[PDB]
Amino acid sequence: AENLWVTVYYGVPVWKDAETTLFCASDHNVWATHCCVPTDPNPQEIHLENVTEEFNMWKNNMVEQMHTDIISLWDQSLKPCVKLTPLCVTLQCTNVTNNITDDMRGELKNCSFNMTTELRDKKQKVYSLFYRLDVVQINKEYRLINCNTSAITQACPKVSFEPIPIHYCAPAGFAILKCKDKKFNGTGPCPSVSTVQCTHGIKPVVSTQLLLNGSLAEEEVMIRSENITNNAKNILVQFNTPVQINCTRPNNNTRKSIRIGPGQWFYATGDIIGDIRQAHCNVSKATWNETLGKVVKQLRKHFGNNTIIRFANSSGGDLEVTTHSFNCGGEFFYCNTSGLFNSTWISNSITLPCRIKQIINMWQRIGQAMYAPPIQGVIRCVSNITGLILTRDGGSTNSTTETFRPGGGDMRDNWRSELYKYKVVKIEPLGVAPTRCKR
Amino acid sequence: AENLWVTVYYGVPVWKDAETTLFCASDHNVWATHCCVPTDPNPQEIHLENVTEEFNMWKNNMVEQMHTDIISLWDQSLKPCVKLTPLCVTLQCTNVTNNITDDMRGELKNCSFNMTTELRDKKQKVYSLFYRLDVVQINKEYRLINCNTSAITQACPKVSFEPIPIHYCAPAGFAILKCKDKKFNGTGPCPSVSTVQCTHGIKPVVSTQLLLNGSLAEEEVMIRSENITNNAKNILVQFNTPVQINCTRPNNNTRKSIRIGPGQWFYATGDIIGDIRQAHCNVSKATWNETLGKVVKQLRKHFGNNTIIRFANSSGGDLEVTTHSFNCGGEFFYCNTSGLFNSTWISNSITLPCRIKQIINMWQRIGQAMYAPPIQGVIRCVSNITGLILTRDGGSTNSTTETFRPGGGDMRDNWRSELYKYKVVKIEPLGVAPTRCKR
Amino acid sequence: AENLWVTVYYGVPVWKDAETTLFCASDHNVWATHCCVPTDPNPQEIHLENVTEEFNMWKNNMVEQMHTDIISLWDQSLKPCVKLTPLCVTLQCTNVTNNITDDMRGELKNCSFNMTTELRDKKQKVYSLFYRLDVVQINKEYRLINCNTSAITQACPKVSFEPIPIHYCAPAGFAILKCKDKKFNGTGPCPSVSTVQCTHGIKPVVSTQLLLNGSLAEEEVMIRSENITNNAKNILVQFNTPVQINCTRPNNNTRKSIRIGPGQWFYATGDIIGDIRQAHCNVSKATWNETLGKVVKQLRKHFGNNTIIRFANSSGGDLEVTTHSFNCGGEFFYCNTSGLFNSTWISNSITLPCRIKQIINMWQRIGQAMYAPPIQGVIRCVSNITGLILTRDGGSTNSTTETFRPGGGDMRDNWRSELYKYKVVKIEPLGVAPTRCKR
Amino acid sequence: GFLGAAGSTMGAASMTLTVQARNLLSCQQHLLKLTVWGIKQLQARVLAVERYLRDQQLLGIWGCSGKLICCTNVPWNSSWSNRNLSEIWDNMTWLQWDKEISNYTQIIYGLLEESQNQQEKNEQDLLAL
Amino acid sequence: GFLGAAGSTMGAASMTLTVQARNLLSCQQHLLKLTVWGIKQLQARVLAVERYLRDQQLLGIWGCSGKLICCTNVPWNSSWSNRNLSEIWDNMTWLQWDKEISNYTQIIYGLLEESQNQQEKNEQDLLAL
Amino acid sequence: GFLGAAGSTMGAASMTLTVQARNLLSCQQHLLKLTVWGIKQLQARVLAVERYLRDQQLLGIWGCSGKLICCTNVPWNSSWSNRNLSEIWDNMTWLQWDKEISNYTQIIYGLLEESQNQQEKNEQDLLAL
Ligand SMILES: *[C@@H]1O[C@H](CO)[C@@H](O[C@@H]2O[C@H](CO)[C@@H](O[C@@H]3O[C@H](CO)[C@@H](O)[C@H](O)[C@@H]3O)[C@H](O)[C@H]2NC(C)=O)[C@H](O)[C@H]1NC(C)=O
Ligand SMILES: *[C@@H]1O[C@H](CO)[C@@H](O[C@@H]2O[C@H](CO)[C@@H](O[C@@H]3O[C@H](CO)[C@@H](O)[C@H](O)[C@@H]3O)[C@H](O)[C@H]2NC(C)=O)[C@H](O)[C@H]1NC(C)=O
Ligand SMILES: *[C@@H]1O[C@H](CO)[C@@H](O[C@@H]2O[C@H](CO)[C@@H](O[C@@H]3O[C@H](CO)[C@@H](O)[C@H](O)[C@@H]3O)[C@H](O)[C@H]2NC(C)=O)[C@H](O)[C@H]1NC(C)=O
Ligand SMILES: *[C@@H]1O[C@H](CO[C@@H]2O[C@@H](C)[C@@H](O)[C@@H](O)[C@@H]2O)[C@@H](O[C@@H]2O[C@H](CO)[C@@H](O)[C@H](O)[C@H]2NC(C)=O)[C@H](O)[C@H]1NC(C)=O
Ligand SMILES: *[C@@H]1O[C@H](CO[C@@H]2O[C@@H](C)[C@@H](O)[C@@H](O)[C@@H]2O)[C@@H](O[C@@H]2O[C@H](CO)[C@@H](O)[C@H](O)[C@H]2NC(C)=O)[C@H](O)[C@H]1NC(C)=O
Ligand SMILES: *[C@@H]1O[C@H](CO[C@@H]2O[C@@H](C)[C@@H](O)[C@@H](O)[C@@H]2O)[C@@H](O[C@@H]2O[C@H](CO)[C@@H](O)[C@H](O)[C@H]2NC(C)=O)[C@H](O)[C@H]1NC(C)=O
Ligand SMILES: *[C@@H]1O[C@H](CO)[C@@H](O[C@@H]2O[C@H](CO)[C@@H](O)[C@H](O)[C@H]2NC(C)=O)[C@H](O)[C@H]1NC(C)=O
Ligand SMILES: *[C@@H]1O[C@H](CO)[C@@H](O)[C@H](O)[C@H]1NC(C)=O
Ligand SMILES: *[C@@H]1O[C@H](CO)[C@@H](O)[C@H](O)[C@H]1NC(C)=O
Numbered sequence A, B, C: 001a002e003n004l005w006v007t008v009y010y011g012v013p014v015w016k017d018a019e020t021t022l023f024c025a026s027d028h029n030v031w032a033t034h035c036c037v038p039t040d041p042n043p044q045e046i047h048l049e050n051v052t053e054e055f056n057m058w059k060n061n062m063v064e065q066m067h068t069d070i071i072s073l074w075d076q077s078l079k080p081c082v083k084l085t086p087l088c089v090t091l092q093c094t095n096v097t098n099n100i101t102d103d104m105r106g107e108l109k110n111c112s113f114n115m116t117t118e119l120r121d122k123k124q125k126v127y128s129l130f131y132r133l134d135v136v137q138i139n140k141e142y143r144l145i146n147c148n149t150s151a152i153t154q155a156c157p158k159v160s161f162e163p164i165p166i167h168y169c170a171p172a173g174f175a176i177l178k179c180k181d182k183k184f185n186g187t188g189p190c191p192s193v194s195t196v197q198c199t200h201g202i203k204p205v206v207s208t209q210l211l212l213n214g215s216l217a218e219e220e221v222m223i224r225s226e227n228i229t230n231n232a233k234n235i236l237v238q239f240n241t242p243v244q245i246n247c248t249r250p251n252n253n254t255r256k257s258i259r260i261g262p263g264q265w266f267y268a269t270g271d272i273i274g275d276i277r278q279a280h281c282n283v284s285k286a287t288w289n290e291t292l293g294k295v296v297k298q299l300r301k302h303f304g305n306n307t308i309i310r311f312a313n314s315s316g317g318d319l320e321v322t323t324h325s326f327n328c329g330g331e332f333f334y335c336n337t338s339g340l341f342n343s344t345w346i347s348n349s350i351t352l353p354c355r356i357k358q359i360i361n362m363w364q365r366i367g368q369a370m371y372a373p374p375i376q377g378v379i380r381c382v383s384n385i386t387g388l389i390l391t392r393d394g395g396s397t398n399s400t401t402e403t404f405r406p407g408g409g410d411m412r413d414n415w416r417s418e419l420y421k422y423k424v425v426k427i428e429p430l431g432v433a434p435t436r437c438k439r
Numbered sequence D, E, F: 001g002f003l004g005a006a007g008s009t010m011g012a013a014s015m016t017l018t019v020q021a022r023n024l025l026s027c028q029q030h031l032l033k034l035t036v037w038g039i040k041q042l043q044a045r046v047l048a049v050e051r052y053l054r055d056q057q058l059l060g061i062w063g064c065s066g067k068l069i070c071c072t073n074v075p076w077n078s079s080w081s082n083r084n085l086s087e088i089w090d091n092m093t094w095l096q097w098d099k100e101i102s103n104y105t106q107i108i109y110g111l112l113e114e115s116q117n118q119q120e121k122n123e124q125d126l127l128a129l
C-alpha cells in the first residue's frame, strides 16, 4: 500500500564486533623497531553522541594479541646471539667471603671451570661469580641450574628491553572504540563511546603481585574481577594515586669477556668492587598504609561494612609466584613482599629484601633459558606502583575475616588493565532501507 | 549487410586448462594442521550437461603438487627435533640370543657405546638394540649405516604421520573438473564432466609394489598405462574389490630415554619382553588367487586370448625397490612379496615375512636420514590392498609368456590413481559476440 | 566571467620522483635463479620529445638497491653449506720448497693437523696447503687467520658467482627513465629522456681501483665526481676504449676431499703439480700509456692547462684498499698496481704481480668469513679495464703538481657508473584542469 | 569524524556516506628480516582489499555502481519490517536498523540480483529494436 | 551451479552471467609459523585480485562499466566469423565460440578502446557546447 | 608509447589517456624458498593494487566512474590559476600544469566530494517525486 522500494546505501556508519590483527606504532630497543610506523602526533579521537556499547575486559583479544606479540618479539631479537651450551660443565665452587656483609653470606659463589678457547684443541681455566639461585650442587661440584632441562642462550648485550610505550592502531576497515564512562568495572554497557585510530601508549611491563607504571585510575581506587564471588578468580586493583617505590642493586659490578669460540663471547660477572650488600626496595610506609585504606574501603563495598579484612603474605610455590618479579635496568629481581601485606582492618619506610637471579626462564615454557649478562656499576630504579593483583580465601559466608593475598598472574593481566577500555570492531558499510524512489 | 555489432559479455561460462596452487582442507598429526580450513560438509558438485573434455592422468599437475607438498610438510614438522649426530660413534655389538626364535637369529644386535651426558665434560655407557639392517661392520666394532653419507635426526616422538584423508580445493577464479565416465582409462575425452569445489578425500599413503587404502575402481578391475606397448612404462592396476591384508610386529618392545644433551633426549629400543619373533603379513590365499584372475582376464584384453601370462618375483636392487615398503603404526616394514607373484595363467593364508628398519631415507635424496623411535608394546595393522604396480618383460612379439613383475615406483604413482579423475581449469569470464544492438 | 569548471582527467602522463623496489630479470649461477623472469627480447624504449629532467648519480637509490641485493643474495646462496669451524685448530706448518721459484719463496705453507673423521670418537691426520696470507703464527705452530674474529664457512663448490648481466625492471605503476644526452656528468638537467621497461644488462662485478667490464663511455673519456673541488671525494673515470688485461694463476692445482663429519666435506688444496710460480696480470704498455694521456687531458680541463699532473702509487692500509681486488674464475687475487701509476705529465707489457688469498672477508663486516675452495688446473682471465677510481691530494691552490692515486671504494661505486643513466619515477594519472563543460 | 554519525538517525546519517567510504581502503628491513611480522602486514593489507572489492562487486551486480545511494525496483516487503517511514528514517539509528533487518539480508540481496538480470536483458533487446 | 550453463547455447547461457561473476572473487599459527605455506596463500589471494581487476579495467576502458552486457559501436567483421546469428546464439556453446574467435581477440579489444576514446571526446565537447 | 605524450600539450595529451591507464595495473621455487625475496614481490604487487584502487575510489566518490574524462559542477577558481584557456590547453604540458596547481589539490578534491553528495541526494528525492 505504501509502495516502498529497497534503496541501497553504501557508507553506512554501522559496525560489528571483530577480531583482527592490530599493527603496532611508537613515537637498540626491540620496540624501537617493532613499532616504527609513527602515530599521528594528534590522534583523531571522535566522540560518538548517543552510543552505548558492551565491553568485556576478560574476553578482550587485544590482551591476547599483546601477549602473543611480546613473546614472539622477545624470541626473535635474541635469536642470533651466542649459545652458552659450552658453559654447562662441572663447576668447582666456593663461597664469596671478601667483604661480604652478614646478610649476604652464602648468596654468591665463586666458581672455576674448564672451558674451551677459540681453538677447538685448547682449553682455558676461567672463573666467574654466580648467585646461588642458579647453581645446583651435584664436595664442591656444582652444575648450572638449566643443564638438566633446557638450552641456555646469552641475551644479546646490546638489545634493550626497556619498556617503551607503544600504541596499537586499527587496519583499514576497522576501528578501535574506547570506553569513556566513569567507574566502568570490567563488563557491561558503557554509555560513552569514543572512536580512535590508535590506543594510548602502553608500556609492556612485566611483573607479578604489584602492577607497575600503568594509568592511575581516575577518580577512586577501583576493584575489578571476572567474578568476585568465585574465589578462584583474581581481583585486580587499580590505584588513583601512585605509590613510589625505589629499588636498588648496590654492589659495584664489573665484567670480563671470555672467548668461548671464534667470534663467540661470553659475559661473566667479575669481582665485586668494594663491600657486598643485599638488593632491596623502599616503599614509603606513610603512603602504603593509606593507599591500602582506600583499597579496603572499596573491598567493604562488596564484602560488608561490618566484616574483617585481612592482608596476609603470599602462599607457597616458586619465586615466580611467591615473590614480586621485577625487571629493571636489565636485571631480574625477586622481591619479598611480606612487609607490604601484614595487617588487619576493621570498621571504626618499608624495606623489602630482594634476590637477584641470572638464569631466567622468561616465559613459562620448557626447553629454553636466558642468561642475563651482568650490568657494570650499580643500578637504581624508580617506579610507580599503580595497582595490585589479589586473591581471596574464605570469610564472606563462613565466619568473618576474608583473607586477601598478593598473587601471581598470567602475564596478560599486566596489560589487561591498560587495554581495558578498548574494543575492536569492523565496519560494514552496506545496508538497505525502504524509500519512495523507483528507478 | 547484417549490421551486427560487437556485444561484450561478462560472466561467460568458459574456461581454459591451467596450473595453479590448490589449497588443502581436512574435516598432533601433521595433516591435522596443514589442512585446517574445513571442507563444506556438503560439497557442491554440479553435473555439466553436454560437456566433454580431455583428461590425462600422466600429465596431471595435481599429482606433482601433492608430491611437492608431502615432502615439504614432512621436513617442516621434523625440523625442530633433536639431531642424533652424537650417536655416530663406534659401537661394540653382539648378537641378541635371549629367547630369540631360530628364524630371527642374527637379526637383532645388542650394542653398547660411549655417549655424552647433559654435561659437556661427562660420559655415560649406554646400550640399545638395533636391527641389523642399520648397523654396518667396521671384531665387534660397528657403525650406524648413515654415518658416511648423511645427517641423522630423530623423528619427533609426538608427531603423527598417520594418513588423514585430505581434500584439495580450488582458489577463487578456478574450478576442479571431475571425470565421471565409466571405464575411463588414463587419457582422452570423458563425456561426463562434473564441477566440484574440492576433491574427495585422499589419504597420503606411501608404498611400493602394492597400492594400499585407495578407491576400489567401480565396476571391474582396470588396467591403465601411459603406453602399454612400451615395456619401459609401468602398468597400474586398480581393483574392484579389496584384498584384506593383516600385518604385525609381534615383539613386545619397551623404551628408554637417554639424555644426550641439555633438554635433548634420545629414544632407544630396550630389551624385548618375552619371545622374539619375525614380523609378517597375512594375505588370504582364496582372495588373492581370484583377484589376480580378474587382473589376468583384463591383461588378455591387451596381450592376447591365447597368450601366456606369468607373474614372477621382483627383480634385483635395494629394499626400497625389491620389497613392499609399508609404513604402519609409525614403523617401517620391508615385506617379501614373492609369495604373491608365483603363477602361470593360461586360457582354459599366504605369509609374507618382513624386515623392520629404523634408519630411514624417507625420500630418495642424499644427505638426510630419519630415525624412527620404536613403538612400545606390539603393533597390528589392517589394510586394504586396492591395486598393483606392475612392469612387463617380453612375450608379445617374441614367443608367448609375457612376464609381469611387481615393481617400484615414483611415490607420485600412489596418488596418481586417486587424483586420476581430476583436472584444474581457470575461468575466463570475458567474451564477445555479434548482436543487433548499438549504443 | 569565463564560466569554467573543473574537469577531471584520468590517465594523465605526469610523474614524480620515487623510490621503490625494482624486480630483477636475466635472459648453478646465483643470478641464474635470482633473475628468472625473462626480459622482453625487444625492450620498448620510448623517446620522449621535449622532456628535460634532473638526474643525480650520487643520490641514486638504484645503486643502493643493487648493493643491498647483491649482499643479500650472496649470503643466502651460501647459507646451507658446511661450516669449517672444526678446521680452527693448531696447525703444524713448514715452507713449501719442492720446485718453488725464488719469487714465491715462503708464500705457501704446508700444514698438517689433527681433524676429526665422520665418527665422533675418531681422528685423522691430514695436511693441506695454504697461502701465507691466511695463516698466522702463534716454533711451527700456526692458526687460521679468522679464528680470533669470525665464523668460517666453505663456499659451496657448486655455486657460481660468475657475473651475469642482469636487468632491473619497473613494477606496475612505475617507469625507469634513461638519460640519453651526450657528455652528461653526474648531476643536473638532461634534455634527452627516454622511457624504458628495464635497464640494460649490468654485470655485478666487484673490484677496487680499476673498474672492470663496464660500458665504454661513448665519445670521450669522462671524469665525474660528487664535488671535484673537495679532495675528500672520489673521482670516477670512464674510458672510451677498453684496456685489455690478461690475468693468471699458473700453478697446476689439485684437490682432495676430506670428511669432517657425516656428509660434511672439506675441500683442501693438494700438492702443486709441476713448477710453482707467481700469479700475475699483463697490461699492454702501449695501450695504458696512451689511455692515461686521455685521462690527463680531461683532468687539465678542471685542474689547469699549465699545471702538473702526477700519478702516484696507492697509499697505506690493508689489501682491500691498497691493491686491486680482482675476483676471477672463483679465486681471489690482490694485485699490485704500482706499475700502472708512475708518471708525471706536463703540457708540451706491464707486469703486475699478484697474491692469492683463500679466506675472504667478502663484505666489510665482522663475524663472517668465506673459504674459497681451490680451482683444479690453472686459470686465465681476460677482461676489459673500463675505468678508474681516483683520489686527489693537493696541488691546485698551493704549488702545482696535483697528485692522483688509485683508491679504494664503497662497492657501490662499481655499479654506480652503469646505473648512472637511470632514474625511477612513479606515475600519478589523476589531475584536473578548467574546461567549458558542465554536467 | 569517521563514525560521527553513529548516533544520528538513519535519515541524518545519509549525509556522511563519503566520510565512512573514504576510510575503508587506507619498517623496511625490520619487517623484511622479521619474515614473521611481514606476513602479518601483507595479510592485513590483502584482506582490506578483498573486503573492499566484495562490496563493490555486489553493488555492481545489483545495478548500483559508482554511487552511494541507489534506488532499485525491488518492492519492500512489509514482512521484513512492518514499520512506516517515520519510524525508520527518524528516531532510529543504522545500527538499530541492522538488528531489525539482519535475517532478511540474503533475501533482499537475491532479489536485487534477479532484478538487474532482467533489466539488462531488456536494455539489450530495446537497443536492438 | 557455477558452470551449470557450460553446455547451454550461447543465448541460453546469457541468463547465468551473475552465477559465474559472483564466484570470481571468493590457519592462524600454522600458516604464520610455516612461513613457507603462508607465502603460497598470499600469492593465491593476490593473484585472484589481480585477475579480477584486469578484467574490470578492460571493461571500464571499453565504456562498459557496472554491467554484465554492453552494446558497443564497433561493427562486427564477417571476416572474424562468417556465420549468421542463428548459428551463433542457438546450437553453439560459449566454449565452442571462443575457439571460433580466439585469433581475433586482440583486434576486437583494440577497436573497443578506440571507440571509447572517440566517444568520450565527443561527450566533453557536446556538454561544453 | 607509455609516456609518449609527456612533452605534448595538455590538449594533445588528452588523446593518450588509455595508453597510460592500461599500464597502471600490470620464480616458483626460487622465490618460495627464498622467503626473503618473495616478501618483496608480494609487497610490490599489493602496493600496485592499493594505489590503483585509491584512484578508482576517488573517481567514484566524485561522481566520475568508468570514464577517463568527467565534467563536474565545481566552478574553477581563478585564484587557483589565473590563466586563460589558451595558456593551458596549448603551449603547456601536464607536468608543468601539475606544478601550477599542486597547492590547491586538496581544495579541489574536497569540493568535488561535496558536489556529488548534493547531487545524489537530489537524484533520490527527484525519483521519489
Ligand atoms: C657458604 O655459606 C653458607 C652460609 O653460612 C654455608 O652454609 C652452612 O652449612 C653448614 C653445613 O651444612 C650449616 O651448619 C649446620 O647447621 C645445622 C643446623 O641445625 C647443624 O645441625 C649442623 O650440625 C651444622 O651446624 C650452616 O648452618 C650453614 N650456614 C647457615 C647460615 O645456615 C655453606 O656451607 C657455605 N659453603 C661453603 C663454605 O662451601
Ligand atoms: C650372529 O648370528 C649370525 C647368524 O648365525 C652369525 O653368522 C654366522 O657367521 C659365521 C661366520 O661368518 C658363519 O659360519 C661360516 O659359514 C660358512 C658357509 O659356507 C662356512 O664355510 C664357514 O666355515 C663358517 O661355517 C655362519 O654360517 C653364520 N650364520 C648363518 C646362519 O649364516 C653371526 O656371526 C653372529 N654374530 C656374532 C656371534 O657376533
Ligand atoms: C719460509 O721462507 C721464508 C723466506 O725465506 C723464511 O723467512 C726468513 O726468516 C729468517 C728468520 O726470521 C730471516 O733471516 C733474518 O733476516 C734478518 C734481516 O736483517 C737478519 O738480521 C737475521 O739475522 C736473519 O738473517 C730471512 O731473511 C727470512 N727470509 C727472507 C727472504 O726474508 C721463513 O723463515 C721460512 N720459514 C720456515 C723455514 O719455516
Ligand atoms: C673491605 O673493606 C675495607 C674497609 O672499608 C671500610 O668499610 C667498608 C664497609 C666501607 O664503609 C668503606 O668505606 C670503609 O672504609 C677496605 O679497606 C679500606 O679501603 C679504603 C680505600 O681507600 C682505605 O682508605 C681504608 O683505610 C681501607 N681500610 C682497611 C682496613 O684496609 C677494603 O679495601 C675492602 N675490600 C675490598 C675488596 O673492597
Ligand atoms: C624365555 O621363554 C621361557 C619359556 O616360555 C615358554 O615358551 C615361550 C616361547 C612362550 O610360549 C611362553 O608362554 C612359554 O611359557 C620363559 O620362562 C617362562 O616364564 C613364564 C612366566 O610366568 C613361566 O611361567 C614359565 O614357567 C617359565 N619357563 C621357564 C622354563 O622358565 C622365559 O621367561 C623367557 N625369557 C624371557 C626373557 O622372556
Ligand atoms: C721439478 O723440476 C724438474 C725439472 O723440470 C724442468 O724445469 C721445470 C721448471 C720445467 O721447465 C720443466 O719443463 C723442466 O723439464 C722436474 O723433473 C723433470 O720432469 C720431467 C718430466 O718428464 C722429466 O722429463 C725431466 O727429465 C725431469 N728432470 C729432472 C732433473 O728430474 C721435476 O719433476 C719437478 N718436480 C715436481 C714436483 O714437479
Ligand atoms: C544437451 O543437448 C540436449 C539435446 O541435444 C538438450 O535438450 C533439449 O533441450 C531443449 C530445450 O527446450 C528441448 O526443447 C529439447 O527437446 C531437448 N532435447 C531433447 C532430446 O530432450 C539439452 O538441454 C542440452 N543441455 C544443455 C545444457 O543445453
Ligand atoms: C681442568 O681439567 C684438569 C684435568 O686434570 C683438572 O685437573 C682441573 O681441575 C680442571 N679444572 C677445573 C676448574 O675443573
Ligand atoms: C625515592 O628517592 C627519592 C629521591 O629524592 C625520594 O624523595 C623518595 O622519597 C624515595 N622513595 C621512597 C619510597 O623512599
Ligand SMILES: *[C@@H]1O[C@H](CO)[C@@H](O)[C@H](O)[C@H]1NC(C)=O
Residues within 6 Å of the ligand: B090, B092, B112, B113, B114, B125
Ligand atoms: C668407553 O671409553 C673407554 C675408554 O678407555 C673404553 O675403555 C670403553 O670400552 C668405551 N666403551 C665403549 C662401549 O665403547
Ligand SMILES: *[C@@H]1O[C@H](CO)[C@@H](O)[C@H](O)[C@H]1NC(C)=O
Residues within 6 Å of the ligand: B244, B245, B246, B282, B283, B284, B349
Ligand atoms: C585379518 O584379521 C581378521 C580378524 O577377524 C580376520 O577375520 C581376517 O580374515 C584376517 N585377514 C586375513 C588375510 O587373514
Ligand SMILES: *[C@@H]1O[C@H](CO)[C@@H](O)[C@H](O)[C@H]1NC(C)=O
Residues within 6 Å of the ligand: C090, C092, C112, C113, C114, C125
Ligand atoms: C695429533 O695429536 C697427537 C697427540 O699426542 C700429537 O702427538 C700430534 O702431533 C697431533 N698432530 C698434529 C698434526 O697436530
Ligand SMILES: *[C@@H]1O[C@H](CO)[C@@H](O)[C@H](O)[C@H]1NC(C)=O
Residues within 6 Å of the ligand: C244, C245, C246, C282, C283, C284, C349
Ligand atoms: C692477452 O692475450 C691475447 C691472446 O692473443 C693477446 O693477443 C693480448 O695482447 C694479451 N693482452 C695483453 C695485455 O698482453
